[PDB]
mmCIF file of C-alpha atoms and ligand atoms in Angstrom:
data_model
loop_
_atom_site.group_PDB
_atom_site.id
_atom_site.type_symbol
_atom_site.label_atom_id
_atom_site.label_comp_id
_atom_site.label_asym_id
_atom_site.label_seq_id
_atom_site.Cartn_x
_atom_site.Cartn_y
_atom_site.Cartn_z
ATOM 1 C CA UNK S 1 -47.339 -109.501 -32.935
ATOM 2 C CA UNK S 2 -48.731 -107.074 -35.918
ATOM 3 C CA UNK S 3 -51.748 -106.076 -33.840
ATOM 4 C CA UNK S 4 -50.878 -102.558 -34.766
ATOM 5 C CA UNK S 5 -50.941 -103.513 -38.556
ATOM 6 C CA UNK S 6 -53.972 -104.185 -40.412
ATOM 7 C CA UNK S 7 -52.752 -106.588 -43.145
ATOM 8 C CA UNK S 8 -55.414 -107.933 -45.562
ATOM 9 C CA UNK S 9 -57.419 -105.787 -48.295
ATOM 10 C CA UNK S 10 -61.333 -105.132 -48.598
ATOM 11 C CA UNK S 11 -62.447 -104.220 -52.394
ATOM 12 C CA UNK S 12 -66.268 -103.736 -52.803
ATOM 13 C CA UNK S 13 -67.568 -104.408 -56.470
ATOM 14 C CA UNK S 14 -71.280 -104.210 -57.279
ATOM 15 C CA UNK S 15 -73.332 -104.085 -60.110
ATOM 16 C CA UNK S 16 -75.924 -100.557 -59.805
ATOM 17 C CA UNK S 17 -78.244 -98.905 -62.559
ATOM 18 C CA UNK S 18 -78.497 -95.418 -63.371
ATOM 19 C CA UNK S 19 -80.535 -94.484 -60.833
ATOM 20 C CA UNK S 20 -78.610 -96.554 -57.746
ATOM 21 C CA UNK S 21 -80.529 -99.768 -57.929
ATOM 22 C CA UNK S 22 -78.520 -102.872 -56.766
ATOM 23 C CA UNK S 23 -81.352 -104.679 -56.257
ATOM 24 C CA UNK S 24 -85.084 -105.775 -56.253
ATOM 25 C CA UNK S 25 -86.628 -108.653 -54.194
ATOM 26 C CA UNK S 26 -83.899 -109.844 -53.300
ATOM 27 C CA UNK S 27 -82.493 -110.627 -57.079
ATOM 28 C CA UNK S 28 -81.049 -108.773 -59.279
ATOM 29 C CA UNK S 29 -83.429 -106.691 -61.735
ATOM 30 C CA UNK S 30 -81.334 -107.273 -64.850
ATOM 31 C CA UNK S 31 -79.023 -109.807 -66.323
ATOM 32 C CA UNK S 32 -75.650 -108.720 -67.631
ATOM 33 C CA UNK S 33 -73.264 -111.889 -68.321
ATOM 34 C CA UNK S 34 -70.583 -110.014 -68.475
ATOM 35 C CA UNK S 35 -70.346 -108.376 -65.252
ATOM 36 C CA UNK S 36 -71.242 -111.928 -63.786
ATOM 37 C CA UNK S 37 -67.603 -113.038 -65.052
ATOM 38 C CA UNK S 38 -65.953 -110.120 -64.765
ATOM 39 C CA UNK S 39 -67.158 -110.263 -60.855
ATOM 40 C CA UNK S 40 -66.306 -114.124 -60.711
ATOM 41 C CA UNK S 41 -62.870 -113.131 -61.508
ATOM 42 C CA UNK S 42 -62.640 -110.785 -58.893
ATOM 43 C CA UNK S 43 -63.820 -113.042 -56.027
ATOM 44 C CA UNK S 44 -62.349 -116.365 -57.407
ATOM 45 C CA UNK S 45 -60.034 -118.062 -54.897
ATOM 46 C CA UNK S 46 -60.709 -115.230 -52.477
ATOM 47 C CA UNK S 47 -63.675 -114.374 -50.170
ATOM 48 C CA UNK S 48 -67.231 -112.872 -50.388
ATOM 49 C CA UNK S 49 -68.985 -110.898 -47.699
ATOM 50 C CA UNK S 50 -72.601 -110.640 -48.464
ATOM 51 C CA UNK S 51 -75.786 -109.565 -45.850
ATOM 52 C CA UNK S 52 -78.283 -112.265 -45.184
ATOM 53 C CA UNK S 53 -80.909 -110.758 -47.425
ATOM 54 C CA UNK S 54 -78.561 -110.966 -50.171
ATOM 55 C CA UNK S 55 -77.662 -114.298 -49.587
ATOM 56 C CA UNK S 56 -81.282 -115.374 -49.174
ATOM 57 C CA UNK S 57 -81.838 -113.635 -52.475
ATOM 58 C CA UNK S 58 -79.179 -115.706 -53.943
ATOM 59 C CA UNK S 59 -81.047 -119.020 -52.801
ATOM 60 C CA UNK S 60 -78.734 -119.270 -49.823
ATOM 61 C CA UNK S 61 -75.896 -120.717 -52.232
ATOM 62 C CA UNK S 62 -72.702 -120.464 -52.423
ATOM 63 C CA UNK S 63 -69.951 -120.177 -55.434
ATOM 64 C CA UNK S 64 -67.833 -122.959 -55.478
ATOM 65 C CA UNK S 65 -64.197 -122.199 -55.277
ATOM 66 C CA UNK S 66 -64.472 -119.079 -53.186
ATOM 67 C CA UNK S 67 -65.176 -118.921 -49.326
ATOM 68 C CA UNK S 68 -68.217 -116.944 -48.782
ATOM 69 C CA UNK S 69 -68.849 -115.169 -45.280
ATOM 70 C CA UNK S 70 -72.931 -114.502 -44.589
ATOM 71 C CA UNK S 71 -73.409 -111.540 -42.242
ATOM 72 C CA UNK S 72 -76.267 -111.538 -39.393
ATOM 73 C CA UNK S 73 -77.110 -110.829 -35.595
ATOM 74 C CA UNK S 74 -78.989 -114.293 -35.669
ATOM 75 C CA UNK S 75 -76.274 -116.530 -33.300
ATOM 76 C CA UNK S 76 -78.267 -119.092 -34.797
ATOM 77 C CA UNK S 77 -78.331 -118.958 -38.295
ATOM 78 C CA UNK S 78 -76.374 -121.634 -40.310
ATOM 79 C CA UNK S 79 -76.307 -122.172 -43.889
ATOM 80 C CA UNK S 80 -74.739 -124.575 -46.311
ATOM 81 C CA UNK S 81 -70.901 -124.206 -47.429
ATOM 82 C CA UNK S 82 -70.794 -120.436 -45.909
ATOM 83 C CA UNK S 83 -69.069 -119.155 -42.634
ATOM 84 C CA UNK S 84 -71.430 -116.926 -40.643
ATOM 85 C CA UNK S 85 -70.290 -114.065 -38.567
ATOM 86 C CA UNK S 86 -72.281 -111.482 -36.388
ATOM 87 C CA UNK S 87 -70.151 -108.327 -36.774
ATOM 88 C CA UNK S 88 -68.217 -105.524 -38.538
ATOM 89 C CA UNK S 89 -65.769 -106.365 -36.267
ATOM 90 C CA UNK S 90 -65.734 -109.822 -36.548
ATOM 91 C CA UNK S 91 -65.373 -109.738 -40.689
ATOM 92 C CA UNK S 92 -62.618 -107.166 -40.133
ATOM 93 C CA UNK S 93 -60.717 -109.679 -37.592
ATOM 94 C CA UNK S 94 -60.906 -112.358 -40.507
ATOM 95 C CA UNK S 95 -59.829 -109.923 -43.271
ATOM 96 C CA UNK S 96 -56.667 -108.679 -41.401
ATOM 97 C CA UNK S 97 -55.405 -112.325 -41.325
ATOM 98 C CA UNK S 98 -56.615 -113.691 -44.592
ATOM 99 C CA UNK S 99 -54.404 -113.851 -47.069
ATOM 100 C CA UNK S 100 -56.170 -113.282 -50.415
ATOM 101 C CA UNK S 101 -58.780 -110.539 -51.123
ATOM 102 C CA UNK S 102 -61.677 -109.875 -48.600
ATOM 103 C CA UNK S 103 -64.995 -108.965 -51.114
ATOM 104 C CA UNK S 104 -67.632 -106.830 -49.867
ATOM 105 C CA UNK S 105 -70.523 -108.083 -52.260
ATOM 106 C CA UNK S 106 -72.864 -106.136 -50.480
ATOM 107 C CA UNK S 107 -76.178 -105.698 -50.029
ATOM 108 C CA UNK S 108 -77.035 -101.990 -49.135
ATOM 109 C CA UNK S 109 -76.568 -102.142 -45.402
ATOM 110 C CA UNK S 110 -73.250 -104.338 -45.530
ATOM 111 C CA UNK S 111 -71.642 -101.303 -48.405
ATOM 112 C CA UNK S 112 -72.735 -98.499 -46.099
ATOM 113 C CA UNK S 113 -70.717 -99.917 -43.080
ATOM 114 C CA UNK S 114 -67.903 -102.199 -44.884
ATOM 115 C CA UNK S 115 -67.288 -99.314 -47.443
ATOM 116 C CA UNK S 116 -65.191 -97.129 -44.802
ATOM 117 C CA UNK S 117 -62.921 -100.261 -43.985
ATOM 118 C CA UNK S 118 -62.477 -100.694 -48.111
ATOM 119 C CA UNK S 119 -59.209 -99.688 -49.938
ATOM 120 C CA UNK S 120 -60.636 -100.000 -53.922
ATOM 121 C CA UNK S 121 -64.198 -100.193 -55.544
ATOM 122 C CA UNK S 122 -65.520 -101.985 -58.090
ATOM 123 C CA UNK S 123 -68.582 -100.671 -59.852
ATOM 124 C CA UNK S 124 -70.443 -101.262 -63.066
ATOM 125 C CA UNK S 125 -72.458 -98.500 -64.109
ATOM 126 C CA UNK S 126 -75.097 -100.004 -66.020
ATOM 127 C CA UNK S 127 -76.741 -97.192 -68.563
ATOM 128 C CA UNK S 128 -80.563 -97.912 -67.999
ATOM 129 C CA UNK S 129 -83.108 -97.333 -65.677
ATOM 130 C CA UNK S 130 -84.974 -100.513 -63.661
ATOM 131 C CA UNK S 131 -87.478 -100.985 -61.060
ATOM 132 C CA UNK S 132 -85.918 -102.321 -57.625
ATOM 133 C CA UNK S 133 -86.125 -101.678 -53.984
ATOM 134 C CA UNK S 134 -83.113 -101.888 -53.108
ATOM 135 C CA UNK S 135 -80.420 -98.777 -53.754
ATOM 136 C CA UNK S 136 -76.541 -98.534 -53.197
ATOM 137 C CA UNK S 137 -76.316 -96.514 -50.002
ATOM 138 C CA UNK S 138 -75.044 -93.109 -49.285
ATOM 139 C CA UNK S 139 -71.643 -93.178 -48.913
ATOM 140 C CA UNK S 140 -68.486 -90.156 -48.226
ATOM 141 C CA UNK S 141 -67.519 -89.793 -51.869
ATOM 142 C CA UNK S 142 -65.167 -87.106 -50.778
ATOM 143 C CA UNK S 143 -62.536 -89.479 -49.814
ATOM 144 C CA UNK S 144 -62.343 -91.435 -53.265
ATOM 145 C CA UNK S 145 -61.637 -90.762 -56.521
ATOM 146 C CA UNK S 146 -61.987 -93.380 -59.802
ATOM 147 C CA UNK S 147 -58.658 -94.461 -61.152
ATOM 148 C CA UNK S 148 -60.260 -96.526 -64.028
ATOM 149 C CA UNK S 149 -62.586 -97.041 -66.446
ATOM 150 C CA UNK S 150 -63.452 -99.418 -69.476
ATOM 151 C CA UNK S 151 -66.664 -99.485 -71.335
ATOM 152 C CA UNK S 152 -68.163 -102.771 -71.852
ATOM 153 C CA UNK S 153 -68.912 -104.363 -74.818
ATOM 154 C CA UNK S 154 -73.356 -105.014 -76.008
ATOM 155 C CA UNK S 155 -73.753 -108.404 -78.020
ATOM 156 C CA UNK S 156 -76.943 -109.830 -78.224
ATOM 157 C CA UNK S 157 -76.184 -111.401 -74.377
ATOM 158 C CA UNK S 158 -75.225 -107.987 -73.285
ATOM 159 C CA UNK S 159 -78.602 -105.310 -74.054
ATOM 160 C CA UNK S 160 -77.083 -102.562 -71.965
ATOM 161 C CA UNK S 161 -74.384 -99.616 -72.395
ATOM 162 C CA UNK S 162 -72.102 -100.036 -69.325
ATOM 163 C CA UNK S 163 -68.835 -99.175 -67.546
ATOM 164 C CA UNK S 164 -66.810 -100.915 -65.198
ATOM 165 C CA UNK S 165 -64.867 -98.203 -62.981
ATOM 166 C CA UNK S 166 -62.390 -98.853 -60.082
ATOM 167 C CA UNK S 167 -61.750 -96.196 -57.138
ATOM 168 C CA UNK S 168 -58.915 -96.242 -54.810
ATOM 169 C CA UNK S 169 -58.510 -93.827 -51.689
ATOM 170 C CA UNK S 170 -57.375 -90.084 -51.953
HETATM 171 N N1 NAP P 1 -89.831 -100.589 -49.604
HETATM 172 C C1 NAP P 1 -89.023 -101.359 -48.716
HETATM 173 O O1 NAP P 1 -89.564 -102.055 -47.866
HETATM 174 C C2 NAP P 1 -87.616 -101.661 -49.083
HETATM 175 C C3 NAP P 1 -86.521 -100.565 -49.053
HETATM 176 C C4 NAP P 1 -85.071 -101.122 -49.040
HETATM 177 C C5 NAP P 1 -84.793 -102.636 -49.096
HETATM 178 N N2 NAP P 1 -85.872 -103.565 -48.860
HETATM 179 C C6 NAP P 1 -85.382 -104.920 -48.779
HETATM 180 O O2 NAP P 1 -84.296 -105.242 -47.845
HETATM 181 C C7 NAP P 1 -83.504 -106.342 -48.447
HETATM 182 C C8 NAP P 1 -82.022 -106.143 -48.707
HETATM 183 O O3 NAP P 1 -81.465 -104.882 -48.420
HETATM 184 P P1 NAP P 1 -79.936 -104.852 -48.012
HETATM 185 O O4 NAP P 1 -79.123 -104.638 -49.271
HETATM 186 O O5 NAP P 1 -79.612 -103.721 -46.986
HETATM 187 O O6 NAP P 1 -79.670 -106.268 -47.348
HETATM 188 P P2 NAP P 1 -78.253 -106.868 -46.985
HETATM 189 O O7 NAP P 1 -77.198 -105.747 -46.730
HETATM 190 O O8 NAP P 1 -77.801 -107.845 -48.053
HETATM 191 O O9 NAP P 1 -78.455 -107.697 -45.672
HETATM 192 C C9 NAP P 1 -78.876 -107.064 -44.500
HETATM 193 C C10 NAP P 1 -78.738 -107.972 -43.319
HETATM 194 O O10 NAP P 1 -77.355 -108.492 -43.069
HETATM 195 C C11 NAP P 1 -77.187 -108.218 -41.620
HETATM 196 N N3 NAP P 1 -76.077 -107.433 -41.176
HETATM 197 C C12 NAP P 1 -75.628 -106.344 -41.802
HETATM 198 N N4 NAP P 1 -74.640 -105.753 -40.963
HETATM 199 C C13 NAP P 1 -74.544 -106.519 -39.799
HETATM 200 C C14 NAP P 1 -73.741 -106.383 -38.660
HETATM 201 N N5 NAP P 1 -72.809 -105.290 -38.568
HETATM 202 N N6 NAP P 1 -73.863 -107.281 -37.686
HETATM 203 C C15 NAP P 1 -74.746 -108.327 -37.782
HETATM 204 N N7 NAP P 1 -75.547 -108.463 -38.914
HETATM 205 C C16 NAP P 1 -75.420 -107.552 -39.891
HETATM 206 C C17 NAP P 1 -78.565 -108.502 -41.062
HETATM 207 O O11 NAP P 1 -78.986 -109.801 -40.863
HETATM 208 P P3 NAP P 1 -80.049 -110.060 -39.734
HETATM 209 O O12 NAP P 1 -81.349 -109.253 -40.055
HETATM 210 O O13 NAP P 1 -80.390 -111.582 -39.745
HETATM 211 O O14 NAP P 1 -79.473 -109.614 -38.411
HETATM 212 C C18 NAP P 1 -79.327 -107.617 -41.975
HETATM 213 O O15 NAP P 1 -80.690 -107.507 -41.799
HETATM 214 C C19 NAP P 1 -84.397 -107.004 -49.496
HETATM 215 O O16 NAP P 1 -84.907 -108.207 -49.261
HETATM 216 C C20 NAP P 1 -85.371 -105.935 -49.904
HETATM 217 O O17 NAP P 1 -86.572 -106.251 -50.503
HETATM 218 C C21 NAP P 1 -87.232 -103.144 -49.156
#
């Protein structure tokens, strides 16, 4: 037994504007093809963790090739081609024994609780201002610090200045 061992790896990776928006009625206010495959890459083969409002906003659908976990207190609630699971504790239970990445795709209540069990982040810092309703949450900066950073590149499918940063633990 390893019950003393925690053995698998949570990265978050979003997509936020200037201001903190992640989201807005359920979508997402912006379109950015790049970070779309950049983030595909990232959760490929491995598995996304995303609220119920977030999957709802996604048309309750998931990516092929990827297991997808939906998060909610609703013993009830089934979806197609997604696990469902009811706790922190629960997703953290699955993550120690899975053997690929755990994703935290959010939305804002699933970063502010996951975030603390995460070991890297992956955000895009998008350089314009949207409307939304939905922020990234507060979160204890003072224990990360960003390792990384690229700029990404505008083309006429890409309007907006952007970064994509990683942060590991200090
Ligand atoms: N002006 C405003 O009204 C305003 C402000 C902020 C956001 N909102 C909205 O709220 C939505 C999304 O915000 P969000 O990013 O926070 O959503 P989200 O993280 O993607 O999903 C939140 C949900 O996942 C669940 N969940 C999270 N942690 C859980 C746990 N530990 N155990 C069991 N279930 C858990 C719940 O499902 P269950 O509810 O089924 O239990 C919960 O309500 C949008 O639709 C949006 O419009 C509007």
């Amino acid at each position: 037994m390893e019950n003393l061992y925690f053995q698998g790896m949570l990265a978050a990776i979003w997509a936020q504007d200037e201001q903190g928006v992640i989201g807005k009625e359920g979508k997402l206010p912006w379109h950015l093809p790049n970070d779309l495959k950049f983030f595909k890459e990232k959760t490929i083969h491995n598995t996304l963790v995303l609220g119920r409002a977030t999957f709802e906003g996604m048309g309750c659908r998931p990516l092929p090739n990827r297991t997808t976990i939906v998060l909610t207190s609703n013993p009830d609630y089934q979806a197609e081609g997604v696990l469902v699971m009811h706790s922190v504790e629960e997703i953290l239970a699955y993550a120690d024994k899975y053997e690929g990445v755990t994703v935290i795709g959010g939305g804002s209540v699933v970063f502010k609780e996951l975030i603390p069990a995460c070991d890297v982040l992956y955000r895009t810092m998008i350089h314009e201002t949207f409307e939304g309703d939905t922020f990234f949450p507060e979160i204890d900066w003072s224990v990360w610090e960003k390792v990384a950073t690229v700029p990404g590149v505008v083309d006429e499918k890409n309007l907006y200045a952007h970064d994509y940063e990683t942060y590991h633990r200090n």
